[PDB]
Design an enzyme around this catalytic site. Structure first.
Site, PDB file in Angstrom:
ATOM      1  N   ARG A 123       0.844  -1.182   0.000  1.00 24.55           N
ATOM      2  CA  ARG A 123       0.000   0.000   0.000  1.00 24.55           C
ATOM      3  C   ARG A 123       0.887   1.243   0.000  1.00 24.55           C
ATOM      4  NH1 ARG A 123      -2.350   0.522   6.324  1.00 24.55           N
ATOM      5  NH2 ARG A 123      -0.664   1.938   6.949  1.00 24.55           N
TER       6      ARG A 123
ATOM      7  N   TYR B 219      11.738   8.548  15.085  1.00 27.01           N
ATOM      8  CA  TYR B 219      11.556   8.485  13.641  1.00 27.01           C
ATOM      9  C   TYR B 219      12.616   9.305  12.914  1.00 27.01           C
ATOM     10  CZ  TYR B 219       9.396   8.741   9.045  1.00 27.01           C
ATOM     11  OH  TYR B 219       9.111   8.677   7.697  1.00 27.01           O
TER      12      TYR B 219
ATOM     13  N   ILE C 135       3.429  12.833   1.908  1.00 26.02           N
ATOM     14  CA  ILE C 135       2.781  12.050   0.861  1.00 26.02           C
ATOM     15  C   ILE C 135       1.466  11.495   1.401  1.00 26.02           C
ATOM     16  CG2 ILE C 135       3.087  10.197  -0.847  1.00 26.02           C
ATOM     17  CD1 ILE C 135       5.106  12.564  -1.115  1.00 26.02           C
TER      18      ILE C 135
ATOM     19  N   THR D 164      -0.965   8.968   2.014  1.00 24.95           N
ATOM     20  CA  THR D 164      -0.935   7.509   2.107  1.00 24.95           C
ATOM     21  C   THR D 164      -1.819   7.031   3.245  1.00 24.95           C
ATOM     22  OG1 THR D 164       0.840   7.467   3.703  1.00 24.95           O
ATOM     23  CG2 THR D 164       1.471   7.553   1.346  1.00 24.95           C
TER      24      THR D 164
ATOM     25  N   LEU E   8      -0.803   5.601   5.920  1.00 30.97           N
ATOM     26  CA  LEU E   8      -0.144   5.987   7.164  1.00 30.97           C
ATOM     27  C   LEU E   8      -0.497   7.419   7.519  1.00 30.97           C
ATOM     28  CD1 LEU E   8       1.940   5.679   9.502  1.00 30.97           C
ATOM     29  CD2 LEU E   8       3.731   6.123   7.779  1.00 30.97           C
TER      30      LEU E   8
HETATM   31  N1  LIG Z   1       3.643   9.121   3.920  1.00 31.53           N
HETATM   32  C1  LIG Z   1       4.568  10.110   4.076  1.00 31.53           C
HETATM   33  O1  LIG Z   1       4.262  11.318   4.111  1.00 31.53           O
HETATM   34  C2  LIG Z   1       6.025   9.724   4.197  1.00 31.53           C
HETATM   35  C3  LIG Z   1       6.934  10.776   4.102  1.00 31.53           C
HETATM   36  C4  LIG Z   1       8.293  10.518   4.061  1.00 31.53           C
HETATM   37  C5  LIG Z   1       8.732   9.219   4.100  1.00 31.53           C
HETATM   38  N2  LIG Z   1       7.843   8.211   4.214  1.00 31.53           N
HETATM   39  C6  LIG Z   1       8.370   6.793   4.267  1.00 31.53           C
HETATM   40  O2  LIG Z   1       7.843   6.074   3.176  1.00 31.53           O
HETATM   41  C7  LIG Z   1       7.732   4.683   3.553  1.00 31.53           C
HETATM   42  C8  LIG Z   1       6.331   4.183   3.284  1.00 31.53           C
HETATM   43  O3  LIG Z   1       5.439   5.083   3.979  1.00 31.53           O
HETATM   44  P1  LIG Z   1       3.857   5.048   3.731  1.00 31.53           P
HETATM   45  O4  LIG Z   1       3.264   6.356   4.071  1.00 31.53           O
HETATM   46  O5  LIG Z   1       3.592   4.477   2.393  1.00 31.53           O
HETATM   47  O6  LIG Z   1       3.396   3.991   4.827  1.00 31.53           O
HETATM   48  P2  LIG Z   1       2.212   2.935   4.927  1.00 31.53           P
HETATM   49  O7  LIG Z   1       1.989   2.616   6.367  1.00 31.53           O
HETATM   50  O8  LIG Z   1       0.991   3.433   4.176  1.00 31.53           O
HETATM   51  O9  LIG Z   1       2.723   1.660   4.118  1.00 31.53           O
HETATM   52  C9  LIG Z   1       3.855   0.947   4.650  1.00 31.53           C
HETATM   53  C10 LIG Z   1       3.813  -0.461   4.109  1.00 31.53           C
HETATM   54  O10 LIG Z   1       4.954  -1.181   4.636  1.00 31.53           O
HETATM   55  C11 LIG Z   1       4.499  -2.387   5.213  1.00 31.53           C
HETATM   56  N3  LIG Z   1       5.405  -2.782   6.279  1.00 31.53           N
HETATM   57  C12 LIG Z   1       5.478  -2.273   7.553  1.00 31.53           C
HETATM   58  N4  LIG Z   1       6.298  -2.930   8.344  1.00 31.53           N
HETATM   59  C13 LIG Z   1       6.815  -3.924   7.528  1.00 31.53           C
HETATM   60  C14 LIG Z   1       7.741  -4.960   7.763  1.00 31.53           C
HETATM   61  N5  LIG Z   1       8.328  -5.188   8.953  1.00 31.53           N
HETATM   62  N6  LIG Z   1       8.038  -5.780   6.733  1.00 31.53           N
HETATM   63  C15 LIG Z   1       7.438  -5.577   5.552  1.00 31.53           C
HETATM   64  N7  LIG Z   1       6.555  -4.634   5.211  1.00 31.53           N
HETATM   65  C16 LIG Z   1       6.277  -3.840   6.249  1.00 31.53           C
HETATM   66  C17 LIG Z   1       3.079  -2.111   5.682  1.00 31.53           C
HETATM   67  O11 LIG Z   1       2.374  -3.331   5.899  1.00 31.53           O
HETATM   68  C18 LIG Z   1       2.561  -1.261   4.522  1.00 31.53           C
HETATM   69  O12 LIG Z   1       2.012  -2.041   3.449  1.00 31.53           O
HETATM   70  C19 LIG Z   1       8.175   4.586   5.022  1.00 31.53           C
HETATM   71  O13 LIG Z   1       9.554   4.197   5.057  1.00 31.53           O
HETATM   72  C20 LIG Z   1       7.978   6.017   5.521  1.00 31.53           C
HETATM   73  O14 LIG Z   1       8.866   6.333   6.594  1.00 31.53           O
HETATM   74  C21 LIG Z   1       6.514   8.431   4.276  1.00 31.53           C
HETATM   75  O1  LIG Z   2       3.779  10.169   8.229  1.00 28.56           O
HETATM   76  C1  LIG Z   2       3.969  11.372   8.363  1.00 28.56           C
HETATM   77  C2  LIG Z   2       3.002  12.182   9.167  1.00 28.56           C
HETATM   78  C3  LIG Z   2       1.655  12.091   8.891  1.00 28.56           C
HETATM   79  C4  LIG Z   2       0.780  12.849   9.659  1.00 28.56           C
HETATM   80  C5  LIG Z   2       1.253  13.655  10.684  1.00 28.56           C
HETATM   81  C6  LIG Z   2       2.630  13.691  10.896  1.00 28.56           C
HETATM   82  C7  LIG Z   2       3.288  14.522  11.931  1.00 28.56           C
HETATM   83  C8  LIG Z   2       3.214  15.915  11.896  1.00 28.56           C
HETATM   84  C9  LIG Z   2       3.841  16.686  12.870  1.00 28.56           C
HETATM   85  C10 LIG Z   2       4.575  16.086  13.886  1.00 28.56           C
HETATM   86  C11 LIG Z   2       4.665  14.702  13.921  1.00 28.56           C
HETATM   87  O2  LIG Z   2       5.349  14.038  14.870  1.00 28.56           O
HETATM   88  C12 LIG Z   2       4.018  13.951  12.937  1.00 28.56           C
HETATM   89  F1  LIG Z   2       4.128  12.618  13.009  1.00 28.56           F
HETATM   90  N1  LIG Z   2       3.503  12.960  10.158  1.00 28.56           N
HETATM   91  C13 LIG Z   2       5.170  12.024   7.779  1.00 28.56           C
HETATM   92  C14 LIG Z   2       5.212  13.376   7.462  1.00 28.56           C
HETATM   93  C15 LIG Z   2       6.352  13.943   6.918  1.00 28.56           C
HETATM   94  C16 LIG Z   2       7.443  13.133   6.713  1.00 28.56           C
HETATM   95  F2  LIG Z   2       8.549  13.683   6.189  1.00 28.56           F
HETATM   96  C17 LIG Z   2       7.466  11.781   7.029  1.00 28.56           C
HETATM   97  O3  LIG Z   2       8.560  10.976   6.834  1.00 28.56           O
HETATM   98  C18 LIG Z   2       6.304  11.219   7.543  1.00 28.56           C
HETATM   99  O4  LIG Z   2       6.267   9.893   7.828  1.00 28.56           O
HETATM  100  O1  LIG Z   3      -5.314   6.674   2.027  1.00 32.45           O
HETATM  101  C1  LIG Z   3      -4.779   7.826   1.433  1.00 32.45           C
HETATM  102  C2  LIG Z   3      -4.348   7.478   0.014  1.00 32.45           C
HETATM  103  O2  LIG Z   3      -3.394   6.449   0.066  1.00 32.45           O
HETATM  104  C3  LIG Z   3      -2.725   6.326  -1.175  1.00 32.45           C
HETATM  105  O3  LIG Z   3      -1.678   5.394  -1.046  1.00 32.45           O
HETATM  106  C4  LIG Z   3      -3.699   5.800  -2.227  1.00 32.45           C
HETATM  107  O4  LIG Z   3      -3.061   5.753  -3.493  1.00 32.45           O
HETATM  108  C5  LIG Z   3      -4.962   6.660  -2.291  1.00 32.45           C
HETATM  109  O5  LIG Z   3      -5.948   5.961  -3.022  1.00 32.45           O
HETATM  110  C6  LIG Z   3      -5.485   7.018  -0.897  1.00 32.45           C
HETATM  111  O6  LIG Z   3      -6.419   8.057  -1.025  1.00 32.45           O
END
Ligand SMILES: NC(=O)c1ccc[n+]([C@@H]2O[C@H](COP(=O)([O-])OP(=O)(O)OC[C@H]3O[C@@H](n4cnc5c(N)ncnc54)[C@H](O)[C@@H]3O)[C@@H](O)[C@H]2O)c1
Ligand SMILES: O=C(c1cccc(-c2cccc(O)c2F)n1)c1ccc(F)c(O)c1O
Ligand SMILES: OC[C@H]1O[C@@H](O)[C@H](O)[C@@H](O)[C@@H]1O
Ligand SMILES: NC(=O)c1ccc[n+]([C@@H]2O[C@H](COP(=O)([O-])OP(=O)(O)OC[C@H]3O[C@@H](n4cnc5c(N)ncnc54)[C@H](O)[C@@H]3O)[C@@H](O)[C@H]2O)c1
Ligand SMILES: NC(=O)c1ccc[n+]([C@@H]2O[C@H](COP(=O)([O-])OP(=O)(O)OC[C@H]3O[C@@H](n4cnc5c(N)ncnc54)[C@H](O)[C@@H]3O)[C@@H](O)[C@H]2O)c1
Ligand SMILES: NC(=O)c1ccc[n+]([C@@H]2O[C@H](COP(=O)([O-])OP(=O)(O)OC[C@H]3O[C@@H](n4cnc5c(N)ncnc54)[C@H](O)[C@@H]3O)[C@@H](O)[C@H]2O)c1
Ligand SMILES: O=C(c1cccc(-c2cccc(O)c2F)n1)c1ccc(F)c(O)c1O
Ligand SMILES: O=C(c1cccc(-c2cccc(O)c2F)n1)c1ccc(F)c(O)c1O
Ligand SMILES: O=C(c1cccc(-c2cccc(O)c2F)n1)c1ccc(F)c(O)c1O
Ligand SMILES: OC[C@H]1O[C@@H](O)[C@H](O)[C@@H](O)[C@@H]1O
Ligand SMILES: OC[C@H]1O[C@@H](O)[C@H](O)[C@@H](O)[C@@H]1O
Ligand SMILES: OC[C@H]1O[C@@H](O)[C@H](O)[C@@H](O)[C@@H]1O
Ligand code: NA
Ligand code: NA
Ligand code: NA
Ligand code: NA
Lengths: 254, 254, 254, 254
Positions: C16, C151, C184, C186, C188
């Site tokens: 996902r 984190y 992004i 997502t 999460l």
């Molecule tokens: N969403 C953001 O804004 C954001 C921003 C910067 C960086 N990131 C990074 O991007 C990556 C993905 O984030 P996301 O928002 O898509 O998260 P998410 O929670 O939507 O998806 C993470 C996926 O990784 C899987 N996963 C978790 N633990 C696992 C494990 N031990 N082994 C295998 N798979 C595992 C989950 O089951 C899930 O399908 C992460 O490394 C996160 O730190 C996210």
């Molecule tokens: O997942 C998030 C996220 C998603 C929704 C809220 C937050 C967040 C915002 C402020 C403080 C704080 O401690 C927070 F966790 N963070 C995220 C947001 C930005 C980013 F650069 C990342 O790597 C992330 O994983």
């Molecule tokens: O859940 C928030 C978003 O997650 C993304 O990874 C999916 O591509 C979107 O369909 C969804 O709206």
């Protein structure tokens, strides 16, 4: 103070604001200080105020002014240990389309080429003293700022030039460093704010732009400069941030 | 290619070197390309070689040349989607004391103000197309280089200006990014090396300056540019390093 | 697509979110993709959806899972060209005093050591293919974030490790790069927001944290990954920001 | 010295090397200093040598040791103004495939989690004093290093954690900064060199890795720490480089 006793320092734009705080910090460290400024008002009063500081009228955009600055410093004090290139200006907020090549050239003349010219003229004497150069750049050279394309460009140039010069002068034992302040409460900050629709709100915004919740003080930039000159003997080419943390952290997908 | 089909791109200094590689990469992506150069030789041949590329003689330091560049692009192709500000020069190695304010001004005119002028004149049309700007800066703007104070300063300025402009143009949906190449094998690199005592050793040094053990190719800078234009829709204000890892790692206390 | 035709890619956490967008981007480029995830729901459906993608249940914190992941990829597809270390977690906001060493260790196990373990097990095969590693770090590794000490620390570690490994693997022709996304949209992000007092305001804040005024999409991170794998042959050890400009700019002296 | 008179400082790993130089710099500034070390030899002698310094045996990887460290500091001196998290280790050069997850965990325990644990236990008292935290990271956290994946990762983590914590503690007036030394001549440097084929050549290489042509001294790192504690009141979340310029500059296309 004795941290920088027997040393001779030139501070450009030292008549007010950050430059005056740097002047005070070096006098308090034991240095003799030459206050360079294009305006007499502040620097002349500072010369009367501070034993150990003297004022020389000098527009850093005028090469013959800067030549005379260096030759008068050497004639009056016999050595030169540190140049602080602080003179500079931030224009009012300007949208990109409201800027001109000619305004950009003029800002480069002050913020970049005046620093270059004094550094160049001072380097023969800094080599003799194993002295150092401190340029006052800006955080926004590194991270950008809205409505300030020319200013940001000039400070990106100063920070990069600092690293280039550090490389060239390291064989001669001359260190070259910069300080990148964030929001410092100075007459320039006050003047820019006064042009805004709500000056008071502009200032409140400026204070809260820092995690520390306040703007910086000239004295804090001054302490950083004295550190770089007097105690940072293994630092060259660094960018010392004095920003209160403004660059840290943050401040549906369609 | 269809990644950037129907789009119109201007590449300055596109007649050889990195600029020619960028031109080829955009033509291969499906774009129509305007090759701007101050010299006819390379760009004219490139225009004959590449369907979809045309040559316009234009010195980016001459505002009326750049005005005509933009107006001819719009007259001939009806839109403008991307400007690649690649025109620039690296002077021969120069010790700081061998530089002049006037040489520094002239280098600023090309590397910094020509980028500024084309970007400014193009922005009205980029807003209409939600287009983007790609500036070609340099790694040495970020980390410095010996015997190159003016060049390093100009590229520090370009990288900072990129971030400032990204901020200003983001409300209009126009992204502004830069590429910072390291050692790329081009006619400029070859010309600089030929001035050295041992050119062959200078080139060997340049290859080994990268962990990857070779210099980069114009085509690799071109692919980065096509990425930024066509697929980096959430990137603005970034500095994309195309350096082969030169900035990584290192290269008694008295 | 043919940009990465005949290539075999492993994406961890590909079921996902960002990982699923990376999976889709590589399938669309012509690659065969192994979806690794600790949960079956998303990845299994993605395997049915995408010809050219298959699902392998694998918890990257379990070394024997990862061993089997690599050996099954090679057994089923005969080669391995790229590993995308995307699996990771952001815990809910936690004040420093509300964190524990044990929670910090567990987060290091996922975000840092799982990336390390797969990379290590894959490198023999990446050397044979002159393949590459893409780690998904975060902007907040570089600039910090409030209420997220563990984190931020894990992502600072990933970004640094990327540079160290790039150095070590460059003699073997294996590039190692990272992507640092900002906000992004997502699952999460949606889950974290739902824990907040006003989730809707938290999301509005997240959108406006970027100059571009929106959050990023998994597909945009995916395009960056395909660029790094398929077209960035002179990039190693870089940190590619996919942040919408969040790191740019800012967001009485007592 | 009176720059930090009446203040109480804890320096971990203060028994030799950089930590001992930091201890000396703070005593010379007027502070009372608690020397924490896991080995008695150096720290005990330093306690006899320096009026104003005392030694407490403490392994920073052992939470009950660190608890006792903080409670003994408060019991004996009544306040706590600054914590310098210097304890750390650089393993011998190790190729990536020669590392283990378990070695990496152990290095994280010292270089990252021990810093975390002392900082956490000290923060209640630093809030009362509006004190500050100084972490000793490394340049190679920022730019990478060959044959050191675990070490580089731990220092990338420390530098990032510094920024995160600065954000969290700024509302309480507690600043959090780090110092990133480059090659400093210490017993660790000497021990690593002695493992090499030609130790003398390894040391010559280390000296010439800096534009300044020498390695740094513990006293220079100490002066930077005293600056951050005593005079950098508008600095938080910064990374102060004490590297002699190693990160500056560089060190056919097929
Ligand atoms: N969403 C953001 O804004 C954001 C921003 C910067 C960086 N990131 C990074 O991007 C990556 C993905 O984030 P996301 O928002 O898509 O998260 P998410 O929670 O939507 O998806 C993470 C996926 O990784 C899987 N996963 C978790 N633990 C696992 C494990 N031990 N082994 C295998 N798979 C595992 C989950 O089951 C899930 O399908 C992460 O490394 C996160 O730190 C996210
Ligand atoms: O997942 C998030 C996220 C998603 C929704 C809220 C937050 C967040 C915002 C402020 C403080 C704080 O401690 C927070 F966790 N963070 C995220 C947001 C930005 C980013 F650069 C990342 O790597 C992330 O994983
Ligand atoms: O859940 C928030 C978003 O997650 C993304 O990874 C999916 O591509 C979107 O369909 C969804 O709206
Ligand atoms: N105030 C801030 O928040 C801030 C932030 C970052 C960087 N800076 C930089 O710090 C420096 C000083 O800023 P400030 O706020 O103290 O400004 P200021 O306007 O209060 O003071 C600048 C001083 O320089 C002098 N000066 C200007 N042009 C000169 C010239 N041609 N020759 C000689 N002297 C000249 C002025 O007369 C004045 O005394 C500038 O380089 C500025 O870019 C300021
Ligand atoms: N070659 C490298 O290693 C390297 C590394 C980093 C950055 N760069 C940058 O990449 C860009 C191109 O470098 P290159 O090596 O391809 O150089 P080059 O000298 O081979 O080609 C530059 C091209 O720009 C043209 N040009 C010069 N001045 C011009 C002007 N006023 N108006 C219009 N066109 C003009 C030249 O005629 C030429 O065709 C420059 O901005 C340079 O600073 C080069
Ligand atoms: N020497 C360099 O060139 C260099 C460069 C950059 C950063 N650093 C960092 O500076 C710090 C000190 O390095 P150094 O060269 O002085 O090392 P060193 O080995 O000479 O001294 C380290 C000291 O820390 C102590 N220590 C180790 N483990 C400990 C533990 N668990 N609890 C308490 N004390 C412990 C040791 O007993 C020793 O007295 C480290 O964090 C290192 O990563 C060193
Ligand atoms: O002087 C200021 C200042 C003082 C008051 C307002 C501003 C300012 C704020 C936003 C956009 C804009 O275009 C602005 F000019 N800037 C300043 C503020 C920050 C900074 F890093 C600097 O180098 C500065 O010179
Ligand atoms: O063109 C070159 C180049 C090409 C050949 C030699 C050099 C060069 C090398 C050392 C110092 C010095 O002053 C030098 F100019 N530089 C170049 C090299 C690296 C780089 F990042 C650039 O932007 C460049 O333009
Ligand atoms: O201790 C050292 C050191 C001391 C002596 C040799 C080395 C070293 C050099 C190259 C690769 C390599 O893997 C190495 F470990 N490093 C050191 C050197 C630089 C640095 F920034 C650090 O943080 C350090 O700890
Ligand atoms: O004008 C704003 C501030 O400028 C600073 O340079 C001065 O030190 C202050 O006295 C003044 O309040
Ligand atoms: O002159 C050095 C190199 O310049 C590059 O721009 C060309 O693509 C090559 O054909 C040439 O070998
Ligand atoms: O062992 C190398 C060096 O270590 C430093 O910490 C000491 O201050 C020096 O006396 C010694 O020469
Ligand atoms: Na006086
Ligand atoms: Na053509
Ligand atoms: Na499938
Ligand atoms: Na004592």
């Amino acid at each position: 103070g004795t941290r920088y006793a027997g040393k001779v320092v030139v501070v450009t734009g030292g008549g007010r604001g950050i430059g005056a705080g740097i002047v005070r910090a070096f006098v308090n460290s034991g240095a003799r200080v030459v206050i360079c400024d294009k305006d007499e008002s502040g620097g002349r009063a500072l010369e009367q105020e501070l034993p150990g500081a003297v004022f020389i009228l000098c527009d850093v955009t005028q090469e013959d002014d800067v030549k005379t600055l260096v030759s008068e410093t050497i004639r009056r004090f016999g050595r030169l240990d540190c140049v602080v290139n602080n003179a500079g200006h931030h224009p009012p907020p300007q949208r990109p389309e409201e800027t001109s090549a000619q305004g950009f050239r003029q800002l480069l003349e002050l913020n970049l080429l005046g620093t270059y010219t004094l550094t160049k003229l001072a380097l023969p004497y800094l080599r003799k003293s194993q002295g150092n150069v401190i340029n006052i750049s800006s955080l926004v050279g590194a991270i950008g700022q809205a409505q300030a394309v020319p200013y940001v460009a000039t400070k990106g140039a100063v920070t990069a030039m600092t690293k280039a010069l550090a490389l060239d002068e390291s064989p001669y034992g001359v260190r070259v460093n910069c300080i990148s302040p964030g929001n410092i409460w100075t007459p320039l900050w006050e003047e820019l704010a006064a042009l805004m629709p709500d000056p008071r709100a502009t200032i409140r915004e400026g204070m809260l732009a820092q995690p520390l919740g306040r703007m910086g003080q000239p004295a804090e930039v001054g302490a950083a400069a004295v550190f770089l000159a007097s105690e940072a003997n293994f630092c060259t080419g660094i960018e010392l941030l004095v920003t209160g943390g403004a660059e840290l952290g943050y401040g549906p997908s369609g």
